[PDB]
Design a protein around this nucleic acid. Sequence first.
RNA 1: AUCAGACACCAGAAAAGGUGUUAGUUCAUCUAGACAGCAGGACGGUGGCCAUGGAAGUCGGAAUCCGCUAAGGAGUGUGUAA
RNA 2: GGAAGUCGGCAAAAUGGGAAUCGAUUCCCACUGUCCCUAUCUACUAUCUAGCGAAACCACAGCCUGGGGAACGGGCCAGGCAAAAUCAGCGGGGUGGCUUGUGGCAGCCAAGCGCGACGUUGCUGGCUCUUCCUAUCAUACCGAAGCAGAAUUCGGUAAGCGUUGGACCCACUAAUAGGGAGCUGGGUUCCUACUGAUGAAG
RNA 3: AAUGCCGCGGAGCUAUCAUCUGCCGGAUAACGGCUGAACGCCUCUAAGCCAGAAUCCGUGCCAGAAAGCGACGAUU
Lengths: 166, 35, 138, 215, 225, 30
Amino acid sequence: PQNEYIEESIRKHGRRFDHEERKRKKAAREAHDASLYAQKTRGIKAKLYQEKRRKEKIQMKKTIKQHEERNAKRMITKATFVKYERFIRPMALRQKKANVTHKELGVTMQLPIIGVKKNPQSPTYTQLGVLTKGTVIEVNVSELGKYAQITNNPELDGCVNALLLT
Amino acid sequence: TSGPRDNNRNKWAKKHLKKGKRAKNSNFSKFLKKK
Amino acid sequence: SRGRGAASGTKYRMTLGLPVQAIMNCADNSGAKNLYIVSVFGTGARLNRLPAASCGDMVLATVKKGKPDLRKKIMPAIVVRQRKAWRRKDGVYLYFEDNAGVIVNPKGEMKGSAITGPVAKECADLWPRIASNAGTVV
Amino acid sequence: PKSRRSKVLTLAQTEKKGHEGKAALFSGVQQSLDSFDYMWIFDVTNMRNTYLKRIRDDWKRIFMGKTKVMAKALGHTPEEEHAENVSKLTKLLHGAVGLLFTVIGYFESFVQNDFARAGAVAPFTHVIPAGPVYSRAGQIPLTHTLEPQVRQLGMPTVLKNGVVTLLADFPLCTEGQQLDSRQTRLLKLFGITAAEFKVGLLGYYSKKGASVEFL
Amino acid sequence: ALRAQFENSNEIGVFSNLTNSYALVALGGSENFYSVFEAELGDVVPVVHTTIGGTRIIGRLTCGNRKGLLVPSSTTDNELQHLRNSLPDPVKIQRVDERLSALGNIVACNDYVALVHPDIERETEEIIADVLDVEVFRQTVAGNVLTGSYCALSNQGALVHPRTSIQEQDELSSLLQVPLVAGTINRGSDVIGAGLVVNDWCAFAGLDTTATELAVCESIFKLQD
Amino acid sequence: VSLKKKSKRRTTRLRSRIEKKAAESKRKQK
RNA sequence: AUCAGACACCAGAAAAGGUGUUAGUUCAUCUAGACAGCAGGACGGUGGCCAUGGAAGUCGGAAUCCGCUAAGGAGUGUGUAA
RNA sequence: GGAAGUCGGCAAAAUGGGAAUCGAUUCCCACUGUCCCUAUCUACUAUCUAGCGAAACCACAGCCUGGGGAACGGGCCAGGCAAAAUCAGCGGGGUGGCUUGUGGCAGCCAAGCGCGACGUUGCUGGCUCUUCCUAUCAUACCGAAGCAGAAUUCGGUAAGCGUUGGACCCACUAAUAGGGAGCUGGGUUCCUACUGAUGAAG
RNA sequence: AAUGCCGCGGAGCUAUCAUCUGCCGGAUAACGGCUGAACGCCUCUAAGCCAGAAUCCGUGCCAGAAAGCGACGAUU
């Protein structure tokens, strides 16, 4: 069949006989259907239904608002950055790039970590380069050297998101 | 494939029993019954 | 679709005497000599049961000895003869003295042209092409 | 939380004045009473807005607002009524009746035809031929391209080969029978001009004569 | 030239055999095949709903002409008696004690001349000449031994492989005294006998036969009139 | 019959643990 | 309550959903006729202007003005290649 | 049929042997109940009987479900239940109401009570085994989709019934869905239960 | 001749290595509808009703309470 064959069939033969009245009835009873769904369904499907009904309800309240005024093993367990190295620092946990967000500019730049100054939780981790929450790390700012503080936990979040000290 | 517990299979099995397919059993029973 | 592909008739249950790993004689003039059984079509889920085939069954075959260009394809094969005795539905027990089969495409027409040796009528009935190109059908 | 009917809303941005509109209509009625002359009593009928605009064109204004709203503003009692002997005029003041300033001959004679409305009686027994539909009931020297009308008609018709075809003839109207909504809607697609706009000039609230007759 | 399918198979030569005096159709499947054959030959020659050895490949198991019919060794007595009762008296039936049971694959026979598998037994050849009353010749078709399956014969025309050479084409025509054309049936299948059954006045081929192929068979068999 | 998937009756550790951690919740909000 | 409750700061899930019910709080019109329901009008400049095969309010880009009013939005949706 | 079994020709049959690589390994041929897939036959034991006749072990014993803060147990709580005496088998019994499907930083709103919800914008271990759950791979029936047909995608009820054979790989299959509650390999230097068999007795 | 070795070998046992057999009544779920309010319209739902899955419950099949029972026969 070529191109828009089904409306060629619709144009030539018409639509199904009961379509308009069936869809009118379905739209009319959809009001009861939604409430029946809300009161019967349980589990994830209920929970996603709850969250999407909250979103739509807040959304329709906002547009009716917008309508209104227009009318009016010794190993390190924390991510690290690269005898004294008695513990094991896995290269997997090791990181080299961090997302530093400028305060005034409000722009997040993914830049390499030049170095780490000190970890507030433990200065011993500073020698190992372990990046923790609140740790001070200096990174190159030529494309923007400046210091910054870690705004999250590298061990949990995985991505080193930090806020620039500027 | 639908099983024997199928309500459809029961329905057209009943349809077979409703027609002459069981009338060969009625006259069959009547033959010994009369003799 | 390969499973019962172009069968033109159902097959009755037959004694299985050619399981997998079997080595068996090529029966056509295509040039192949020996076949190795890799798998059989239409085997379900039976724990520990070795897949097996009978006369007229279609198998996956590898030409162990034969022409090189005939090889390097896992080609469908039709088991035409079987050494294990089987009960024909009319009651007689039959067994050919060697296990023979033919190299065939998935559709059901072989690459060969003439069959050397007897052909089981069960094989010749599920596969009209083999019956068409058979020399003696028993 | 409560089994109550939903109240849907749209983005029309055309809310009416309500009480303010009624007050404006009352003020306009008072102004029309204070107007110069011609003391008309005619506001609207089954005719369309185009007919009303055409009637208003031959005037320099037809306006009544909500019916009996102007009568309430005037007052049944003569003391509240601006005119004289309005106690009997208020009772006759019903339906669509209003004043104008520009006449009598045009109102009595000029009655343009218009599409009929439900509730009245058809002037004849209109019938529709079977087979393909006729737009002008055989008066067109009539395209059958009204394919969506096949679904939207409800008459015994089937859309065959892209053309709306009626299996059997159906009499749309019958003489001496009240017109129903279905018949009126079906006749709307055709040329059923079964209407005649009229006016009422029984009396005139003249400034000096003040004789609103009931003829 | 007509298009027919036994069950849902393009090979009608395997499941039926047609001559100038009778027709044979398989038994136990759908008689729509028997229905089609009766629609064109019911008023001309008898149509027998027969099996050979409890088998439906009667077309490739039995070879015959307008005069006589042959059955292999595996033919049961009941079926042979059934065939004799069905066929008219002026037609003779013969059992063959041949090692090559597939008579329809080893013998391609028209009313006057038959060409046979090269390695046929002498006693088989003698009884074929006695029953069929045709001149028998041992030769291969396109280097292929199955003459009955790889060649179709009629009184006025015949077909062979497209793989045959022109000199083989001329030699086969000269040895058969009938026009012969190199062609194919059922859209490129080189089993002409399995895909085509022809009498002297009508032809049946599989429904998957191309229009060009049907024109070729009609052209060689002169069936327009 | 219970006609439930989860038992309406509670274990003594579980009932005791509510007063253990409900009080701590008031401590935390304080 | 087609998986009710007897639970025990109902504290983990907990933020909330429901055309289930009963009470309230604050604003709305209403015998100048309330909501709804059926009958009808819901227009004419105008197919406003760019935008296009074809877009006439409703593929699509700013509004979105006016004669009439009791009201007809350069138009709420369906729909039409239009 | 011929190692398809197993980590693997362990063990038997070929009588063990032919060629390669470093006694070992591989390959081709050969053989075979390791296996498909178990069946049959013999002797002994186990069975019963005559005689003889122990020991370990022993607070007392002997059903399960939920609870008993724990350690849940057999004794306690609430239930299902519950009928003498026994025989032969086989060996079972000697720690959040957690958790799940939707990441981290900043800004803009702003239902509301300095926060502020949704949004919105910014960036880098395997061999066999009983049963249960649904969170369904297939089979049954439905809804939606450019769903013309065929084939198909997603979603709903649904656990009744299936979910393989070989070295992640390649086939079969309608599908090869996910989990809960006798044994061996490479890796570090009495009673009670279950199953059958008798058995006193209104 | 500790079943000396070999062939055949009834009976028995046995092999998806052989043959046979494996069925229909309700109630529902998803879902599709009828009438019909709530809410003078509408609506599969609220009261009721219909159709509807290999689902649940029965029929069928196995066991027979050894503390469930009935009929019949004889009765020293």
